[PDB]
Amino acid sequence: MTSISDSQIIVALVSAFITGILALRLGKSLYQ
Amino acid sequence: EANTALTITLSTGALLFLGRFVFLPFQRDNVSRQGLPVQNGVTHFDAGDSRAQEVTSFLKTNDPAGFTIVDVLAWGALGHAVGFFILATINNGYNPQF
Amino acid sequence: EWLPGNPRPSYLDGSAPGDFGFDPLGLGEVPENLERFKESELIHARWAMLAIPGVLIPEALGYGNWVSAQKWAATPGGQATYLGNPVPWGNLPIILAVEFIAIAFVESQRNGESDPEKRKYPGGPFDPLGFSKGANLEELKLKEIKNGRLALVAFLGFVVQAVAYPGTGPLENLKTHLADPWHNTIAHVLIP
Amino acid sequence: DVAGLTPCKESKGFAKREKQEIKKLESRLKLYAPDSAPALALNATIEKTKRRFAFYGNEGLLCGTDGLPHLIVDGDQAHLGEFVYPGLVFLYIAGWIGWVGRAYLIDVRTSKKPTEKEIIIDVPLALRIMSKGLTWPVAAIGELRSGKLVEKSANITVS
Amino acid sequence: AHSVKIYDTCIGCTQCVRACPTDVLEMVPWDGCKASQIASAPRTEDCVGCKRCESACPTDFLSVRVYLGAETTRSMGLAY
Amino acid sequence: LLFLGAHFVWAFSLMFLFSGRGYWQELIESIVWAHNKLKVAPAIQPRALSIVQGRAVGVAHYLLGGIATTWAFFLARIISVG
Amino acid sequence: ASRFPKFSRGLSQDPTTRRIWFGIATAHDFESHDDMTEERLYQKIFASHFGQLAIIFLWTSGNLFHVAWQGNFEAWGQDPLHVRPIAHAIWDPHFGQPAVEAFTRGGASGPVNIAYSGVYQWWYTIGLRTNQDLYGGSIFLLFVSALFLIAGWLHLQPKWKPSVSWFKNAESRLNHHLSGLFGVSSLAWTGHLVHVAIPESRGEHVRWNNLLTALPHPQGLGPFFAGQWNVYAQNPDSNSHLFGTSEGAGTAILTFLGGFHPQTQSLWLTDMAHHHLAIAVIFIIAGHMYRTNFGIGHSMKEILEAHTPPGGRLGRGHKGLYDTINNSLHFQLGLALASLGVITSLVAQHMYSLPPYAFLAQDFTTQAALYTHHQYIAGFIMTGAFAHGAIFFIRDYNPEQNKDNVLARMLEHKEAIISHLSWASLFLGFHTLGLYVHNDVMLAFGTPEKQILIEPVFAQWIQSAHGKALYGFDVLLSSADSPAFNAGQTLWLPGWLDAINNNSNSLFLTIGPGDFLVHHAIALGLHTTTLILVKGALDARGSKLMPDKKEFGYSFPCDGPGRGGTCDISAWDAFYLAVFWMLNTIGWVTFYWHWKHITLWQGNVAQFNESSTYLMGWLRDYLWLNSSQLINGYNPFGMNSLSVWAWMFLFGHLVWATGFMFLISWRGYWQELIETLAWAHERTPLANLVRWKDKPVALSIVQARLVGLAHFSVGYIFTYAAFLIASTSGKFG
Ligand code: CLA
Ligand code: CLA
Ligand SMILES: CC1=C(/C=C/C(C)=C/C=C/C(C)=C/C=C/C=C(C)/C=C/C=C(C)/C=C/C2=C(C)CCCC2(C)C)C(C)(C)CCC1
Ligand SMILES: CC1=C(/C=C/C(C)=C/C=C/C(C)=C/C=C/C=C(C)/C=C/C=C(C)/C=C/C2=C(C)CCCC2(C)C)C(C)(C)CCC1
Ligand SMILES: CC1=C(C/C=C(\C)CCC[C@H](C)CCC[C@H](C)CCCC(C)C)C(=O)c2ccccc2C1=O
């Protein structure tokens, strides 16, 4: 019986932000 | 019940013997005819694929027949495979009356 | 010559042994194909000629039907009984392995031949009596190819008669034809 | 029998359908005078339905679970009249029409103005060609073997 | 910025020049046909792409060809 | 029956409405080759319908299908409940 | 280069709104960009493929996270047959209170969406049990997507950029891809199954903490290296086994039972394990085929050259095809798309009849949705394969190098191919529509015994050859005397025959005249779509009407009104026309599947068996009958949970209708109308203060065709999806 903690949501959001930064870098490399 | 060591030994020995003595001329001249993967009339390494340079230190031979370690690996793999096929077929326990 | 008065194909002049100009489908138009077909006809025919005595003799002597001769395999046990005597090495796997290795070595040795005439007619160690030295090669080759074609047709008949009458051999079917010829023939299979 | 299909005469559901149709027709009939024209027309329809059901049952048709006839077209000897015989008749007729059309086109092709005969049909020549179509298979095989059926030098585009 | 090409199968009937709505084509002296003239396309910057010239050309296949390309305020036919 | 047939004709008009002439002309070229191979090509050369004719055929079959659908629907409903 | 289309000068210099549209529409076609070299093309493609992989993995991670956060995965796991899975929560400010009440399904505390993707069954079957497992998977997939993004950025750097010769190493790439990406991946999946998922279905709990100590078998790896491979199949699961518990659970890991698990009505897990293990072995062996740096193996060019029939019936054979395929990216893309479309259709056909996931085949809506989804994907993929093959003919084909080989000789008898395809299409169309209309007339006149009902005896014979004992053909597996039945009577045939003779599942459903007619309509659709696509591909380089089409590219509007008119003349237009036929064919297929399964699930198969032989039967008993609850989603008396599906139904009908406007009305009308609008704007007080930067123009001809087709396809898909989901969820039976 589990329900996902709030700190887990914080970790997921931070990881998503880092992945978005990486995607921005890749898109910039593709454009240039 | 089949002896694993005896079966694998016999099968691998038979395949190695076949490769070294029986089918060796056929393998040799067929691989000579199908020389190298070639693009636009030139090999990949000469076309400019640095990762595609053939390794010759791993192809040195001292057998009179020029038998190579990669040949050892191929025929031994076939031998292990045939031996395990025979072992599994013997121990299958499936004996259909045809 | 297979059909009187028929025109003969250009490539089949009539010099090869057993050449009667028979080629309705035009399969021998390609020369290399013709050479390969000559060698393959010789091999198939020699195998059939060497086979059919082993199809007839056991049935004549009993303990054999050339279809029940393979019955011991595909049966748990029975790895025995060559000629009414058990075979000490009759097991299926060893028989299969020995046959494969031996025939593979022999046939690969055959495949290593350059001269097409030597591909078809080796000579030497395969002619211990030197029959190929009596200046009768053409007639001997004609006799060989004729008996071989007859043997090929005979073995095809064996196979088809085994299909039509399961559990029977050739001599049994011959005795059936002789028992009542006018009501025991291929009409019972072609016309149900 | 074939594919678990029962004969129409033996089947129940065929007879049920016949009974239902006859009952509906008689229910319609109940509204009219016995000797009037609508009564005669309804009676004629009833007799036609009876004759149709009898013929279908006696002809040897297979019947499904729902009570309707099914057709067999795999070549069975007991059901040649379902597919093979009408197929042969259609093939004869269609070959006849196609062959006579081709013959008329070929005969018109060598004329003073082929297009005028293409829109305005030469009736006598058309009738002659049409009458000669009885033996079309023999003529078709004849031209196939004689090498006068196909062409070899035809217009094509840039390959 | 369309491109108009003339090929050496031209017979110099001048129909393409008469059909052009923007005066892109003109006739030029030539040798190689009975009329001894051929069509030219100097003002290709004014071509709109209507392909009337191609419709007016009598030849198995066209001696004048129009290849549509980059669009411009003149090619788009804009009055505003 | 006419309800279904009118839905059908209305659908059929869309193939004239949505398509162009060049495709059908090239397909007719291939079919004309097929008829030529057996010496049975017509004297009057087959041609695809013109652009204006394609539009006219499309609109005519479209209108016929739609109006016949409404006709069958109205008549059936009002004869049944009227 | 200066303006928005940085890759195109002609589009950059365009003063109209066409610049924006065409800059969007041609952005991802790298061969057409200005100053494009082969090396840059290959590297850009490689990085874009990395980006696509990252997007896919983020999509999966998002599914996992949203299900773990807002879904009742554990409650569903406790009672799989009585709980509705939850896809994602709803937060719509535009709702009213009745909608909030109506959308509170499951055990949720607010409005939610019920999932129809089947990921609950898939995740439950593979060992996932709690929400922490789903969260860990989501975080791991985030990490994987980050890794692919880093990989793309790195392999675009000047130090790490691969060379053109590296991208053309076909033998080495195929060797690694075949060995690793297939065989080793399936071997690892077998490892996961055996080591984790099979114990989960028997009441065990294996995770990363106890992976190193939990034996998959009581005697692990002893028999495997002793040659006693049969020890791992001694004790399979019992027929009374309860999935997820230890009641009647065996200890075998690689069985070969065949058939279905009685409680879950899905394939056995141990069967799936031996399957993926055998596939792994086969692929790992097949990898060691082509020559590389070690001096052994085949050479694909020599294989292609050697294969050439004597007598010249095939011409020069497959000679010269190696360079043609290696140097053409469109040839490779077409081959890949054709294979992927066939594989997707195979997945769709083989998943509804042999369900692999526990608790599936009881969730009817999920099964229908999965079938329709992957079948539409397959249709689009096939159409794309043919389109990119036509692009190959136009762009990469070199006539001189492909002199008299199979590829050129295909262009050689193209008229024969198109003619015989046209004949097949016409034959099927005439006689099939004739039979349907004849049956309609027979039933209209009240005489249903006069219709032409043809038994599909060939498919029934094949079904009897599989062991179905209903049609009384008694052949092959239906015959107890057959060699095949005797050979297989101990390995797989008990379970397979028990499954195939059951008439409640979807394994080889019974068929009749209606099934015959529908497979024939499907054949008509297939041959006609193939006709259109092949005609477009073969006539791409030129025809009699326009013998120099190859100079005008793949896509162009027309060739003017000369020579009789040349509308829809390019191969792109053949693609455009064939998309309609693809949609129609897939619609027929999905209609047939859905009606047959609705009748099967309701138990009333007689309605399909009787009403499918005529078209009024379809229109009355499928569409009109099953649209009731859909159209009653919201009414003047309130609203249900089907309100969203009713709204989507109307939305799809509307978008599909809107596509007709672009499809029927052409450009000149709109251009003149826009001219009048521009005059109006320039002459209006208080509006002259605002000026456009781009001169407004009407859409292009090809752009109009594309936009019409897009609105059309979106309407088609949304309408049928809404109808399917609503008509299957209102009853759940
Ligand atoms: C063993 C080493 C190895 C491995 C693992 C890979 C793996 C890969 N390479 Mg590759 N490559 C290799 C060696 C290798 N390569 C070598 C040596 C070279 C140079 C000669 C290259 C050159 C190369 C290029 C140039 C490109 C790749 C690309 C790719 C990727 C293809 C896209 C993808 O994920 O498909 C995944 C495919 C599968 C998993 C196969 C599945 C089989 C079918 C489709 C489905 C069956 C599964 C089952 C039925 C469904 C279950 C699903 C579930 C929902 C139930 C893939 C990750 C491409 C890429 O994307 O770049 C990043 C690319 O452009 N490679
Ligand atoms: C049934 C589908 C359909 C629809 C909706 C339209 C819509 C339209 N057509 Mg049209 N057309 C169609 C089919 C359709 N067509 C077909 C099949 C043909 C072929 C015969 C034509 C032929 C045609 C011609 C020849 C002409 C039109 C014209 C018009 C316009 C009418 C005037 C206007 O602005 O309406 C206003 C109303 C609407 C646009 C619909 C209501 C607005 C909806 C509800 C949405 C608005 C809010 C929206 C949510 C905004 C938020 C967006 C945001 C979320 C992104 C309008 C754009 C005429 C035109 O140009 O107008 C001057 C015109 O001359 N059409
Ligand atoms: C020097 C010399 C000598 C000797 C030699 C020798 C001794 C050799 C050996 C060799 C060998 C001895 C080899 C081997 C090899 C092997 C191998 C290479 C193997 C492989 C395997 C595999 C690959 C497997 C796989 C698998 C698995 C894993 C699982 C199950 C399935 C299978 C089976 C598939 C002499 C005296 C003659 C003299 C001269 C010199
Ligand atoms: C135009 C073009 C193109 C395209 C093409 C295409 C798109 C195609 C397609 C095609 C296809 C799409 C095909 C398909 C096929 C399939 C097949 C051919 C299959 C087969 C199968 C079989 C044969 C099976 C068998 C069996 C059975 C029945 C049972 C079980 C067992 C077995 C398995 C044996 C390209 C790119 C090349 C380029 C050039 C141009
Ligand atoms: C289908 C279609 C065609 C093809 C249709 C054609 C060629 C019309 C065919 C009409 C009939 C079927 C011709 C009949 C010929 C004779 C009258 C037959 C006489 C013999 C008996 C049948 C009476 C176009 O040409 C076309 C052109 C422009 C836009 C759209 C389309 C379009 O959609």
Swiss-Prot record, chain E:
Cofactor binding note: Binds 2 [4Fe-4S] clusters. Cluster 2 is most probably the spectroscopically characterized electron acceptor FA and cluster 1 is most probably FB.
UniProt name for this protein: Photosystem I iron-sulfur center
UniProt-annotated binding residues for [4Fe-4S] cluster 2: 20, 47, 50, 53
Top EC category: oxidoreductase
Annotated TM spans: none
EC numbers: 1.97.1.12
A GO term, aspect molecular function: electron transfer activity
Quaternary structure note: The eukaryotic PSI reaction center is composed of at least 11 subunits.
HAMAP family given in the database record: PSI_PsaC
Reaction catalysed by this enzyme: reduced [plastocyanin] + hnu + oxidized [2Fe-2S]-[ferredoxin] = oxidized [plastocyanin] + reduced [2Fe-2S]-[ferredoxin]
Keywords for the protein's UniProt record, in alphabetical order: 4Fe-4S, Chloroplast, Electron transport, Iron, Iron-sulfur, Membrane, Metal-binding, Oxidoreductase, Photosynthesis, Photosystem I, Plastid, Repeat, Thylakoid, Transport
Database matches in NCBIfam families: PS_I_psaC (TIGR03048)
PANTHER family according to UniProt: PHOTOSYSTEM I IRON-SULFUR CENTER, PHOTOSYSTEM I IRON-SULFUR CENTER-RELATED
Occurrences of domain 4Fe-4S ferredoxin-type (ranges): 1-30, 38-67
Binding positions ([4Fe-4S] cluster 1): 10, 13, 16, 57
SUPFAM superfamilies on file: 4Fe-4S ferredoxins (SSF54862)
Record's bilayer topology term: Peripheral membrane protein
GO cellular component, one term: chloroplast thylakoid membrane
Cited function: Apoprotein for the two 4Fe-4S centers FA and FB of photosystem I (PSI); essential for photochemical activity. FB is the terminal electron acceptor of PSI, donating electrons to ferredoxin. The C-terminus interacts with PsaA/B/D and helps assemble the protein into the PSI complex. Required for binding of PsaD and PsaE to PSI. PSI is a plastocyanin-ferredoxin oxidoreductase, converting photonic excitation into a charge separation, which transfers an electron from the donor P700 chlorophyll pair to the spectroscopically characterized acceptors A0, A1, FX, FA and FB in turn.
A Gene Ontology BP annotation from the UniProt entry: photosynthesis
Compartments (UniProt record): Plastid, Chloroplast thylakoid membrane
Cofactor dependency: [4Fe-4S] cluster
UniProtKB/Swiss-Prot annotation, chain F:
Transmembrane segments: 1-18, 56-76
Positions that bind phylloquinone: 24
Residues binding chlorophyll a: 15, 23
Subcellular location: Plastid, Chloroplast thylakoid membrane
Identification of the protein by name: Photosystem I P700 chlorophyll a apoprotein A1
Signal sequence, start to end: none
Function comment: PsaA and PsaB bind P700, the primary electron donor of photosystem I (PSI), as well as the electron acceptors A0, A1 and FX. PSI is a plastocyanin-ferredoxin oxidoreductase, converting photonic excitation into a charge separation, which transfers an electron from the donor P700 chlorophyll pair to the spectroscopically characterized acceptors A0, A1, FX, FA and FB in turn. Oxidized P700 is reduced on the lumenal side of the thylakoid membrane by plastocyanin.
Assembly information from the UniProt record: The PsaA/B heterodimer binds the P700 chlorophyll special pair and subsequent electron acceptors. PSI consists of a core antenna complex that captures photons, and an electron transfer chain that converts photonic excitation into a charge separation. The eukaryotic PSI reaction center is composed of at least 11 subunits.
Family statement: Belongs to the PsaA/PsaB family.
Sites where the protein binds chlorophyll a': 7
From Swiss-Prot, chain G:
GO BP: photosynthesis
Recorded catalytic activity of this chain's protein: reduced [plastocyanin] + hnu + oxidized [2Fe-2S]-[ferredoxin] = oxidized [plastocyanin] + reduced [2Fe-2S]-[ferredoxin]
Record membrane topology: Multi-pass membrane protein
Subunit description: The PsaA/B heterodimer binds the P700 chlorophyll special pair and subsequent electron acceptors. PSI consists of a core antenna complex that captures photons, and an electron transfer chain that converts photonic excitation into a charge separation. The eukaryotic PSI reaction center is composed of at least 11 subunits.
Gene name per UniProt: psaB
Pfam families referenced in this protein's UniProt entry, alphabetically: PsaA_PsaB (PF00223)
Bound cofactor: record note: P700 is a chlorophyll a/chlorophyll a' dimer, A0 is one or more chlorophyll a, A1 is one or both phylloquinones and FX is a shared 4Fe-4S iron-sulfur center.
Name listed for the protein in its UniProt record: Photosystem I P700 chlorophyll a apoprotein A2
Family: Belongs to the PsaA/PsaB family.
Listed transmembrane segments: 45-68, 134-157, 174-198, 272-290, 329-352, 368-394, 416-438, 516-534, 574-595, 642-664, 706-726
Organism: Physcomitrium patens (Spreading-leaved earth moss)
Ligand binding (phylloquinone): 670
Location of this chain's protein in the cell: Plastid, Chloroplast thylakoid membrane
Residues given in the record as [4Fe-4S] cluster binding sites: 558, 567
Biological role stated in the UniProt entry: PsaA and PsaB bind P700, the primary electron donor of photosystem I (PSI), as well as the electron acceptors A0, A1 and FX. PSI is a plastocyanin-ferredoxin oxidoreductase, converting photonic excitation into a charge separation, which transfers an electron from the donor P700 chlorophyll pair to the spectroscopically characterized acceptors A0, A1, FX, FA and FB in turn. Oxidized P700 is reduced on the lumenal side of the thylakoid membrane by plastocyanin.
EC number: 1.97.1.12
PROSITE patterns per the UniProt record, alphabetical: PHOTOSYSTEM_I_PSAAB
HAMAP family noted in UniProt: PSI_PsaB
Coiled-coil ranges from the UniProt annotation: none
